């Protein structure tokens, strides 16, 4: 089910799906596993909303356990490139790449809901083939890990060495702990 | 696909009842169906932030974080979310039922309510097992605190009662403080 | 595909304007939710005109069916139940739950009643909790069957221990339905 | 991919009071037919309905939902056999309004006794066996009523698969006439 | 493959009056243990039998075939826990002759209530639920007898998984002593 | 679900801003869709630039060459912007963009390596397919050399195995021209 | 296949499989994944070789990536219990529980072949179910991890704290590194 | 069963003649059986030669090294004869034979290449496993250099990709000592 | 099962004492190794008595077949080859590899020759290496066929580009076998 809303016009009626209707309020949803196709859709929505009005805020609701890093960095670089401030709101959970995109929001507009969960940890990977090729892919994953820690350090305001220590294994944070760590700025309870 | 629809001049029975400020939470709670409920709520607030929203719940439960995305949306939006239990509200469904606005949490007479502690499952190195084991305790504690707050029963009693599956009738759900009243006839 | 009519409506939306709802196939949450939704819609449309629920169901999930039953009782409109093809298990329960004097079998429709089914796996403590719950549900279903049929709970219990098949005539004599429709 | 004309092809023919019963008979497709019949009755309860049947049969109760709908509604339901009408499809063909049951020249009709299948306790098997016999007796009675042949002859003939040509279906009394050209 | 001597290694150690209970307890492997116990009794009904247990548990009725065979035969059955004895394996460990129930130093013992599962008509579910409660009560009674702990305490402690070290198994009364060298 | 605007879907609405998306594995059908959009935008205005956002790990070479040959053929300059990553054929279509209009975003990844193949059958057929794979490998290395301005011998050495480049390394190598951070 | 050897007797001939023949030389093989059944067979061979002669050495050839811990601890407790010294020789590799049973040999008789590989790391596990049950199984894995570190410390002569640090992640050792770490005593190249 | 007498197959009969067969994929259980046969033949007679017939495409390195170390440890010289093919680990065990007693048959095929592997998990774990495969790769190149008498740099270069050798080429390279055509 | 005979031997072990070896079905490492093992055994038993290799094979793995071929050429005894049923691909190669004057077809036996099959997937550099190797093996196989048949390599190459089916008589005329055996 995708719920529709009917707007009456001079020439009868037209129809909007609920998500298209909330897109007019400049609200984008990032829901479930981060992969190329759904991530492109999020990026497209950001580019559209920029063209519509490049000075109004964009609200990105995140409920994700993470997924593909490159797919996520397509969203990240879009958020930084576009003029509008992208306010990030955590719903349910933002883990792995979802936490990274949550902390990547415009400073002062990164929000957790009270019972939302945040989790951070180092990249995952896996190659198979000749020893020479394993060394090349092993070198690449280390470069990506260094870069992801560098960006986390920038957005949190914590030193890179501390980000590295804390993401060696799964680190779960409550909403309060995400504010204290510097992943988000404030907690929204009631409007 | 979309059931009992008419073309606009597809508009279905759920789209029609959404105008009456009615949202349906049906079946297993997971990210996508939960995102749809939250979206409907955000929409109904923008339409009118002062009229009540009616959330019909028939769910055995599911993913806690997905359910919490609805719970936090219910508390955040200005409108009171009235919860009505149809058929059953169990696990996460029972949680969202009791999370309705005080005075407007309703069971139908032959609706079934069931509460129990969280489920989980990790595999890997003992160090990681300890981290996830700790995280599951944190979530279990939080869920008991919120269940205590909404029911008005002490956390020690919620914890005791939810160690194993606890089935309640509509009458028992009112007594326990999960719901406020029973609706039989209009 | 489902045919459309221009006046543009699918055939079910068009029959819904005549206050007709269809309960077809296995009773589960999603199809049962739809039935309940249609009942709420028709009440809001007109709370004093009868609703016609056509039933062709072998049964299914009890809680899903109790979502329909509780909706039927709650809404102001009388819900007339008509049995097409068959009403077995939960379908039979929803057929007999209709407004008194407006529960109808068609001549060659079949009705079947029997006790609930269930199944759990795990610790003996949990098995005992689930066994108790299934007994409470069985007692409650037998009580409501007794209420709607007018037969005593003891007889309903005896008759539903094993599968009991009724013709249209036998369903009238048992009190599951009131009358049989052949022609207008 | 169903073609358009404003209307889909089946919806356009539904304005001409034409319903199609195609493929295996089961609860959902059978309900759709019964719904189209109730709709056409509300539209005009005196004009004929045309039910084109191309079916190998299927679920009896699903078929009986159509049969009872056909008998209840005021309009005469003319049945036309396209390709084949076997088992339950043959039963619904013979259930049409007398004078208006039609086979096309190369259509195939076939009749045989019900199939079933239960497993479990001997007590439950006895209950389910008794139910299958009652259904078989009832199905034979209704076939006897619509064909005009006695129940004893319907019973003997449906013990095993009995195939009929269009000519043989008219002789047996399953249909009234054959349409070759308009 | 199982190596041989001039007899396979298991037949050769059966001369030393040693029986192995290894892996999941089911009808066929349990029948083999009970068969070996009847054989060793017929060979010499006075000399002790050594049962080496390395089992996570399994089918209760299959395990009760070994238990009843242990009690029935004239010879004392000395139980030695190697690797682990959990669930039904723990039950057979504690069912050994008093003073001859042994844990090796790094062997693990675990006890918990029975598992079950039926599906069908509510009447049948009630019959199978009652049966599972009767078995649970019986298993607790026999655990109480062999440990010396009261039935009420055994019931509480087996509501959920309870892991014991070799030392804890001695303190609980599941085994009598620990063999090291 | 792709949302609608007033009525267009979001991708049709961004196509009016002359923006095309190349997303996921390169195969015949998605590649055809890119080339169709390129022919459409040319007809609409054959002088205004086209913007191709690339986020691809690569895929089928022939499918990718359908996009490459469409890019060169149409009058409008095709500006290529690397989102997330551009590897294999994705990198090839990135470097194929109009010179001075090939862009990486800061944390976008670029990777290049030689073609993959595979035939089974008679030794005669294996020889024919092996030759064909060498000719394609040569042709791809020539086109990479032409677009980067690096000699073919260097492109061959550097693509014998997987070669991963950052945004900065992609500019130095000559795969892209510039990096875009903020508008 | 398994190759047979024929011994001639007064009454014609008898036949041994190669493994049964080498068992008369007091040689046991621990090969592949450690699980209850193959481990029970190793223990049975040890109890047999004790009964035959409780003063002569037993040679346990190890080529294993590891497996079930309780299965391996059934072999460990048998080794310590029986009178005979169990000399452990590493063939190909001894990882995980493989490395644990290699180091559990009689002191001075733990051997690596030159190109054999040794690897050590902390226990693996995995439960699913009620939070209460997860807690119990999580407490059990920790208790087992402590016990395994204690025994590794005792057999290697390194302190428990160093064993714990070094086994948090996979630690690979060459034959030389295994002697230096104290997992084995000596390296056999030629007889 | 096999091709036997009841008193015992053709392999058991040829084991009496001090002949062992290494056939098919190298893995723990078949490699354990080879090493066992080698220990048995030493105990029977530690001075007579052992003949190891090798027809293998290779397999698990650690399994193959259990044989290698057994070959070097036991007192008897192990003569290696290549039947059909010796590739990867099979070629390694062929070249590991006693100097002067490593034999190719005329139409036997030899192929050498670097190790294969694969891990998936946390970047930290990947770094550890990536290091281990480099150590193993070095060690295998060192042992090949020793047995062939070629420098490790040439072994490394040649095994970066698959290198196929004829019987003649295997003698020239030093993988084997001589070719046996007729007795 | 395989029948036994008492003197206790299986039927194949008994015929092995008559110096008969069977090559039956798809040629692969394990079954080819068994044939080679038998050839070494019979040489050790008596290096001056002929060995009789019965061939019924569609072919299979070339290297596995070359393990038999090199064993045949190496051992002192003449290896007589008799074709039962069929000798195709590698089986035809091993048939023609028998001692000159002792390569035999049975009257209704079928022979078939064709060029090698192969298959690699991976990087274009690896595909070039494997392609070159396939061509070297193809050249070597054609050379050895040319030697044993006494036909020039150009003709063997032409005739094996596609599947070439020969009767017993056609096999003798081509030089793949020397004579046909009908009766003893
Ligand atoms: C959190 O989202 C992480 C996991 C999904 C839990 C995510 O950040 C992650 O590690 N993703 C991994 C990934 O994208 N890895 C790529 C790759 O191997 O190609 C590398 C660029 C990482 C160095 C997995 C593969 C999804
Ligand atoms: C009721 O709905 C419970 C289950 C469906 C029976 C639900 O509350 C629940 O426990 N869900 C469980 C869950 O969400 N667990 C998560 C997780 O493991 O990620 C933790 C937050 C709880 C420790 C699973 C999804 C059923
Ligand atoms: C008739 O509809 C019955 C079956 C379909 C034959 C139906 O009444 C029924 O018993 N359904 C069962 C069911 O809903 N059981 C629930 C349950 O276990 O959830 C028990 C609570 C009933 C006490 C089965 C599960 C379909
Ligand atoms: C012709 O259509 C027959 C079969 C498709 C061949 C049909 O008449 C039939 O026998 N249907 C069967 C059926 O519906 N049986 C039900 C049942 O199993 O409950 C009994 C009521 C009739 C004996 C098959 C099983 C669909
Ligand atoms: C320990 O070994 C227990 C499980 C393996 C964890 C074992 O004692 C157990 O509970 N076994 C169970 C069983 O045998 N149950 C039978 C049954 O349901 O048939 C009942 C007689 C006990 C209530 C499971 C089924 C193996
Ligand atoms: C990058 O995109 C490469 C692969 C995804 C790794 C791509 O360049 C590539 O090699 N594609 C391959 C391909 O298209 N090969 C064709 C073919 O064999 O059909 C040949 C033309 C290459 C010589 C694979 C097969 C997709
Ligand atoms: C090396 O052998 C380790 C793994 C096989 C890589 C081994 O020591 C190991 O961790 N085994 C795990 C194990 O035995 N776990 C049991 C269990 O949870 O059941 C615990 C007793 C260990 C804490 C197996 C692989 C699960
Ligand atoms: C030749 O036999 C090679 C392959 C079979 C083609 C063989 O040498 C090889 O590389 N084997 C590989 C292997 O054993 N890898 C192990 C491993 O990943 O565990 C590493 C020690 C290699 C550095 C694979 C597993 C067959
Ligand atoms: C006849 O027996 C041939 C095929 C079965 C038709 C046989 O001669 C053959 O070609 N076998 C092939 C083979 O051995 N190919 C290897 C290989 O690809 O590894 C190459 C050496 C071919 C040059 C196939 C694979 C069975």
Give a short synopsis of this structure.
Chain A has 7 helices and 10 strands. Chain A has helices at 18-23, 36-52, 69-81, 97-103, 131-156, 160-166, 175-181, and strands spanning 4-9, 12-17, 27-31, 58-64, 86-95, 110-112, 117-120, 124-130, 171-173, 186-187. In chain A, strands 3, 4, 5, 6, 7, 9 and 10 form a 7-stranded mixed β-sheet that branches.
Q: Any chance you could write out the topology, listing elements then pairs?
A:
This is part of a larger assembly, with nine copies of chain A.
Chain A: E1 4-9, E2 12-17, H1 18-23, E3 27-31, H2 36-52, E4 58-64, H3 69-81, E5 86-95, H4 97-103, E6 110-112, E7 117-120, E8 124-130, H5 131-156, H6 160-166, E9 171-173, H7 175-181, E10 186-187
Supply database-style keywords.
part of a larger assembly, 9 chains, 191 residues, alpha/beta, seven-stranded mixed beta sheet, two-stranded antiparallel sheet, globular, serine protease (chain B), ClpP/crotonase-like_dom_sf (chain B)
């Amino acid at each position: 089910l995708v719920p529709m809303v009917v707007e009456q016009t001079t020439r009868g009626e037209r129809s909007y799906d609920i998500y298209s209707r909330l897109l007019k309020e400049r609200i984008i949803f990032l829901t479930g596993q981060v992969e190329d196709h759904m991530a492109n859709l999020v990026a497209a929505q950001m580019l559209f909303l920029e063209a519509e009005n490049p000075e109004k805020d964009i609200f990105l609701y995140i409920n994700s356990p993470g997924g593909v890093i490159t797919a996520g960095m397509s969203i990240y670089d879009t958020m930084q490139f576009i003029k509008p401030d992208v306010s990030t709101i955590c719903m349910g959970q933002a883990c792995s790449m979802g936490a990274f995109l949550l902390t990547a929001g415009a400073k002062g507009k990164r929000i957790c809901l009270p019972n939302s969960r945040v989790m951070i940890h180092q990249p995952l990977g896996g190659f198979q083939g000749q020893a020479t090729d394993i060394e090349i892919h092993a070198q690449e994953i280390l470069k990506v890990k260094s870069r992801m820690n560098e960006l986390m350090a920038k957005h949190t305001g914590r030193p890179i060495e501390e980000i590295a220590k804390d993401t060696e294994r799964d680190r779960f944070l409550s909403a309060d702990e995400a504010v204290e760590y510097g992943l988000v700025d404030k907690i929204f309870t009631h409007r």
